[PDB]
Amino acid sequence: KSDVFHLGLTKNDLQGATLAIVPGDPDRVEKIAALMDKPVKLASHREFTTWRAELDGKPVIVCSTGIGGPSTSIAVEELAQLGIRTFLRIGTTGAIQPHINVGDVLVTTASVRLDGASLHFAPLEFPAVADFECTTALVEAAKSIGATTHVGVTASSDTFSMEEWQAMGVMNYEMESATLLTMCASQGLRAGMVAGVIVNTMKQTESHAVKIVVEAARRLL
Amino acid sequence: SDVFHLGLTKNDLQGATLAIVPGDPDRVEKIAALMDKPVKLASHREFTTWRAELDGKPVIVCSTGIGGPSTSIAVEELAQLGIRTFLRIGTTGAIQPHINVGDVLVTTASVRLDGASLHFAPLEFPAVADFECTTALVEAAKSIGATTHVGVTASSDTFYPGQERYDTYSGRVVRHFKGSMEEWQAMGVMNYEMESATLLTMCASQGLRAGMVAGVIVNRTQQEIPNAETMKQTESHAVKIVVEAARRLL
Amino acid sequence: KSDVFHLGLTKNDLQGATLAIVPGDPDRVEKIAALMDKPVKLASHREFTTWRAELDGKPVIVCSTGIGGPSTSIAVEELAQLGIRTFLRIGTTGAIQPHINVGDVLVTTASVRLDGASLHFAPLEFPAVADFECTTALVEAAKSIGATTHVGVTASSDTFSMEEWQAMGVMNYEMESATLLTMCASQGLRAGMVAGVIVNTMKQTESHAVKIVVEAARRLL
Amino acid sequence: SDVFHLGLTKNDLQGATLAIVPGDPDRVEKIAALMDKPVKLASHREFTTWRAELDGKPVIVCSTGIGGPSTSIAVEELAQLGIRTFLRIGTTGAIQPHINVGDVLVTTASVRLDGASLHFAPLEFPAVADFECTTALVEAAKSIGATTHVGVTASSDTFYPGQERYDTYSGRVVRHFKGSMEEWQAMGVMNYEMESATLLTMCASQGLRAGMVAGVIVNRTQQEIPNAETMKQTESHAVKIVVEAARRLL
Amino acid sequence: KSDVFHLGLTKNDLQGATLAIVPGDPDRVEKIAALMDKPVKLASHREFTTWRAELDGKPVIVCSTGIGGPSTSIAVEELAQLGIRTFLRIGTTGAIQPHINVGDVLVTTASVRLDGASLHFAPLEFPAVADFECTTALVEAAKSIGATTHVGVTASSDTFSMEEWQAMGVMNYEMESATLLTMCASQGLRAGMVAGVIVNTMKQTESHAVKIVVEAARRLL
Amino acid sequence: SDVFHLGLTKNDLQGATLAIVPGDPDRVEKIAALMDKPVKLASHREFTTWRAELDGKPVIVCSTGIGGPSTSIAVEELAQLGIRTFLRIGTTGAIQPHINVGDVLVTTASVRLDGASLHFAPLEFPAVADFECTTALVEAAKSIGATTHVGVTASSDTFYPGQERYDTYSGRVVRHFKGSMEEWQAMGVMNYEMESATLLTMCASQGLRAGMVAGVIVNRTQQEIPNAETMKQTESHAVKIVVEAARRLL
Known part of the structure; x- marks a missing residue:
């Protein structure tokens, strides 16, 4: 008995949580939950593994999205x-800008909509823009730990032009931001996106990014 | 090891050229069990792979996960x-009043309501299934006296708005998809799913054979709800059909 | 007095026929009708020349479509x-694949929609796919006479990229399949497409293709 | 012989540079009869060509058949x-309440609801008629006291759904064209036809002159049905007008 | 108190005028008005400067459109x-055709719709065609003063392919015709477009074009 | 002189790298007056430019005129x-019931309902504002206790049909925009304007910083009409906010 078709969860399981951190895989979910108090695995069905934890005494959810905009x-x-009304995504990606070094943190203000799923929520002309408060929380959290941060646009497609996006200032590529941002920005939900640069130390970069997204959640509660 | 995500080497396949590709990795073992000498090869994320033997030849069973990108x-x-032959198998809901639970659907082509398929071919290109695979699937279904429907499937990048569901958080559907289900229905589309566009398009445009069969476990256009047992029976029948079709494609 | 605007025919003229073979020109119509019993010319207005015949005692119609998706x-x-609820098209075309020899038979499973008329029936995303039963009948008919058959995708446009379609496995080019297939597949009508390869013997190829489409009709009655 | 389909040689035209292009080959003889020394040149499929003389100069009359591809x-x-000057002539229905049977329409430009025109120019390019041809047609119509309407025509690749007709086998129209007639009507579009988009676009983009005139023989927005005689009279008037315009374009 | 949101005018100000000449800038408005009788400046708000004048005793309006389709x-x-039900636009532009000389006059029959605003009035497939009567008046007016005239298509975009349009017979480029023509042709309004070629004498060319548009207005009253 | 339209030389800016860009040139003087040593630089068409001093640094105030092309x-x-930092300031109407006159809007990104923005980047690219500019604007608004709304704005190439207004000459809206306002409303769009798409897109795609703030002087979804005084007060507040944000961006 579940209130949802895929997550296999019930309203009561969230214990009032209104904020969820949504990484792409189950392994990262555990890592994120482990940084908080009272971490407990709630469920696991297909790509969707969900844990629950507490930040400053408030319940927070951590759930994997799977691969691409459709699963997300x-x-x-x-x-x-x-x-849930606030979604913070964290991941690791490469950088396409020379001035971006491995170990730096990328906070996405908006994404280039090169996917298919975002179109199921709003026409292409609509901006896949992140919530101002979420973006602010991610930037302050990164600064609170002395991380070198880059804030800007990310390219988001369904595949796992090139010099074009780089010439337009695109920081990196990934596959879920366009759907996430568009979905939330066009449905009254708050969403933010942060990523650790692992290529253009890897585990350290993921750790620092995981810490940042959790500290940002804390500023959003 | 030769491939990143799947975590497999070519030697692992032992020369297999045909793979049954279910969506859920938890269904891989069951499908493989129908055949001889079933062995687990790997399991990473939602990518579970098992190898088995069908009539003396090695066969692969590998999960795709959810969505076109994952597929x-x-x-x-x-x-x-x-792998040069792909047989998609799973369960689905139907959007046609005459299609009942327990029935089986064999997809000849899919409406491309996705994005990943666009990376392999322009929208003008048809997400069509291979004739031999489709034939094998149809004949296999008939060999077990299953009520079969052969036609178009709508392959959507979303489970909710692209399938015009209003029982959601926002309760709204973007203009582009408003009234789209009624349209597909009037055009004879049998059901909705989320992976065929990518599978059929990339296979048809790269000289690879692909087909898809699915058992109906629900019909949103009917008031009567599905039986708990009839649904489980449908899953078994679908697996039986895909394996039988595989035998004819070796 | 006609029940239709262009064909100049009445319901009674078909004598209950539910299947029509639709070639592009009047000369081919006659050739097709001649292979059956009781061939009779029903009407001829502009591009639309219609004959009636009998296959295994059942009435069948043969009507020319004209040029392109609009006339079709x-x-x-x-x-x-x-x-009519079943349409079988037969024609002659060239091949763009090296492995396809002159004299071979092409059975279309689906077409690349490069035309304009198919859009008046369904959005581009909808597949211009042929009916499974019709495709099966054409394949079996070709095999019944020992014809070398290729089954696959055909490119269909309004003109009388190139290496692109060839790289994607496209067998040949023509101008009516996209409209025909899309029209029928999106309106509950059954349609099939078969073509004799005359370039990449010509009259023999047309004859063999004409025989195949008639034998397929027989399997569809 | 120099051209495949038409089956004509350049010598056959005797230097003609202007051609009247009706849709039906059965109307070619009649149009040519209005001029001097009418002679049949060829007839293949729906491509009938006749040559005649207008004021001492050779003129061509050739049918286009139905649709943009054929045209x-x-x-x-x-x-x-x-041929560098093309004059389209025919009969059509109207979609404006104020346009009556017997009236004549001169098309300044067409809405491109086709596919063939896209092969000669992007959709952004206007399917506009040549000013001199349009002028000639308008003045010719006036010379015979005909009630003339000069404006936009909608050129569709289909006779049924693209013209939003519901009196069909399916009785349905694809989303894209649902309510399209009302839209064209509110925008001042006079009528629907199926060849102008291609003719005007390819001529305007290749330095060739083209115009189009048509007699109204029916109006689907009016309850009153057309007269059997008034319709025949309209065809004759349209032919008279296109020939008179040709004289002014020599 | 104005009957409109931007022009700052009232119905009474037009004194029954049903025809307006719409150049791009205020300086040109004055020049045009000066050629007529009883010239009087009515208003000036942002890009919209309007004057009133009389041609053959009939009131005519002259109003600046500003830059691009949006302002127009x-x-x-x-x-x-x-x-107002009749709009005549006059401007100066360059020519992209070798056979067009500086000092010649261009009368636009239709425009290539490379803008964004025309789409807010009709789908791209709809022709940005000029009114036949207006086009005729402009051509006759140009001829009445012995001006060498070219009649054809103009490219209209939002920016201040190239060999493509030139190969398709495009005479010149500008930024307002597409919006103006489409707007009027799809709303029952009459519109014409005339331009003096200043590059491929400048003030003389503008003068001759100003005279032509005024003489065309006279033939349209 | 170095630039055609603006009629300015680089020396005129005295090294200024930040410009406040209002739409109306008649508002330039007022904005510049808030700062030190205000001086008029040029005025051509709707392009009025003034230079001033903010905390010892030179600042530019230049009008854009109406529409994306002009901008x-x-x-x-x-x-x-x-100039590498652009701060858009003006007044606007709102399309959300909860947003009242006197409130201030800070735009994070705009829906691209224009054409000019397409010349700098594909539609897929977001017309997003610079984070530092947006932050500065938000904090400046808060420093004066203004009720602030931060979200999406719809940037249209037309004032009427693109903003789905029916109180017009034709009284009709093209299919594409029919029901579009209700759609934007349900998606959380705060208001309509006509220049942001171009400004944000070209700046975000060329390494330049841009932001936008606007005071609400009217709300078409509310029955109550705006006060004549409350509106003037709103304009002053908006100017105060943009200047204060500029100080934080020097």
Whole structure:
């Protein structure tokens, strides 16, 4: 008996949580949950592994999205049905800008919509823009730990032009931000995106990014 | 090891050239069990791979995970490993009043409501299934006296708005998809799923054979809810059909 | 007095026929009709020349479509209003694949929609796919006479990229399949497409293709 | 012989540079009869060509057949033969309440609801008629006291769904064209036809002159049905107008 | 107190005028008005400067459109609300055709729709065609003063392919015709476009073009 | 002189790298007056430029005129003159019931309903504002206790149909925009304007910083009409905010 079709969760499981951190894989979910108090694994069905934890005494959810905009759309929709209104995504990616060094942190203000799923929420002309408060929290959290931060646009497609985006200032590439940002920005949900640069130390970069997204969640509670 | 995500080497396939590709890795073992000498090869994320034997020949069973992006990764890596024939199998809901639970659907082509398929071919190109695979699937279904429907499937990048569901958080659908289900229905589309566009398009445009069969476990256009047992029985029948079709494609 | 705007035919003229073979020109119509019993010319208005014949005692219609998707759409719509539910197209074309030899037979599973008329029936994302039963009948008919058959995708445009389609496995080019297939597949009508390869013997190739489409009709009655 | 489909040689035209291009080959003889020394040149499929003399100069009358694809073949081959001025003539229905049967329409430009025109120019390019041809047609119509309407025509690749007709086998229209007639009507579009987009676009983008005139023989927005005689009279008037315009374009 | 949002005019100000000449800038407005009788400046707000004058005893309006389709759409809409039904645009541009000499006059029959604003009035497939009567008046007016005239297509975009348009017979480039023509042709308003070629004498060319548009207005009253 | 339209030389800016860019040139003087040593630089068409001093550093105030095309000219020429930070300021109407007159809006990104922005980047690219500019604007608004709304703005190439207004000459809206306002409203769009798409897109794609703030002087979704005084007060507050944000961006 679940209130949702895929996550296998019930309203009561979130214990009032209104904020969820949504990484791409289950292993990262555990890492994120482990940084908080009272970490507990709630469920695991297909790409969707969900844990629950507490930040400053407040319940927070951590759930994997799977690969690409399609899987992400399912996780975000169902989590929203469960009461979540703030989504913070964290990941690791490469950089396409020479001035960006490995170990730096990227906070996405908006994404180039090169995917298919974002179109199921709004026409292409609509901006895949991140929530101002979430973006602010991510930037302050990164600064609170002395991380070198770059704030700007990310390219988001369904594949795992090139010099074009680089010439337009695009920082990096990934596959879920366009769907996540568009979904939330066009449905009254708050969303933020942060990523550790692992290529253009890897585990350290992931750790620092995991810490930043958790500290940002704390500023958002 | 030869492929990143799947974590497999070409030697692992033992020369297999045909793979049954279910969506859920938890269904791989069951499908493989129907055949001889079933052995687990790997399991990373939602990519579980098992190898088995069908009539003396090695066969692969590998999960794709959810969505076109995840599917493209699985398909391309399997192709790199020598797989040239892909048989998609799963369960689905139907959007036609005459299609009942327990029935089986064999997809001839899919409406491309996705993004990943666009990376392998322009929208003008048809997400069509291979004739031999489709034939094998249809004949296999008939061999077990299953009520079969052969037609178009709508392959969507989302489970909710692209399938015009309003029972959601926002309760709204973007203009582009408003009234789209009624349209597909009037055009004879049998059901919605989320991986076929990518699988069929990339296979049809790269000289690879692909087909897809699915058992109906629910029909949103019917008031009567599905039976708990009839649904489980449908899953078993679908697996039986895909394996039987594989035998004819070896 | 006609029940249709262009064909100049009445419901009674089909004598219950529910299947029509639709070549592009009047000369081919005669050739096709001649292979069957009780061949009789029903009408001829502009691009639309229609004959009636009998296969295994059942009435079958043969009607020319004219050039391109626009003319074809008229012939298919009006024939459908007259009771036809199964359409088999036969033609001769060139091949763009090295492995395809002159004299071979091409059975189309689906077409690349590079035309304009198919869009008047369904959005581009909808597949211009042939009916499974019709495709099966064409393949078996070709095999029944020992014809070397290729089954796959055909490119269909309004003109009488190149290496692109060839790289994607496209077998040949023509101008009516996209409209025909899309029209029928999106309106509950059954349609099939077969073509004799005359370039990459010509009259023999047309004859063999004409025989195949007639034998396929027989398997569809 | 110099051209495949038309089956004509350049010598056959005797230097003609202007051609009247009706849609139906059965109307070619009649149009040519209005002029001097009418002679049949060829007849293949729906491509009938006749040559005649207007004020001492050779003129061509050639049918295009139905649809843009067929029209493009006729136009390009005639262009290869030296034709640089094309005058489209025919009969049509109207979609404006104020336009009555017997009236004549002169098209300044067409809405491009086709595919063939896209092969000669991007959709952004206007399917506009040549000013001199349009002027000639308008003045010719006035010379015979005909009620003339000069404006936009909608050129569709289909006779049914693109013209939003519901009296069909399916009785349905694809989303894209649902409510399209009301839209064109509110925008001042006079009528629907199926060849102008291709003719005007390819001529305007290749330095060739083209115009189009048509007599109204029916109006789907009016309850009153057309007279059997008034319709025949309209065809004759339209032919008279196109020939008179040709005289002014020599 | 104004009947419109931007022009700052009232119905009474036009004194029954049903025709307006719409150049791009205020300086040109004055020049045009000066050629007529009883010239009087009515208003000036932002890009919209309007004068009133009389031609053969009939009131005519002259109003600047500003730059591009967006500003033009505002001026045309509001002038139409005020009673204007005929719009004649005059400007100066360069030529992209070798056979076109400086000092020649260009009368636009239709425009290539490379802008954004025309789409807010009709889908791209709709022709940005000029009114036949207006085009005729401009051609006759140019001839009445012995000006060498070219009649054809103009490219209209939002920026201040190249060999493509030139190969397709495009005479020149500008930024307002597409919006103006489409707007009027799809809303029952009459519109014409004339331009003096100043590059491929400048003041003389502008003068001759100004005279032509005024003489065309006279033939349209 | 170095730039055509603006009629300015680089020396005129005295090294200024930040410019406040209002739409109306009649508002330039007022904005500049808030700062020290205000001086008029030039005035051509709707391009009025004034230079001033903020905390010892030279600042520019330049009008853009109406529409994306006009704005692109102003922005590119200012960029050529060394401007790397652009602060858009003005007044606007709102389309959300909860947003009242007197409130201030800070735009994070805009829906691209224009054409000029397409010349600098594909539609897929977001017309997003610079984070530092947006932060500065938000904090400045808060420093004066203003009720602030931070979100998406719809940037349209037309004032009427693109903003789905029916109180017009034709009283009709093209299919594409029918019901579009309701759609934007349901998506959280705060208001409509006509220049942001171009400004944000070209700046975000060329390494330049841009932000936008606007005071609400009207709300078409509310029955109550705006006060004549409350509106003037709103304009002053908006100017105060943009200047204060500029101080934080020097």
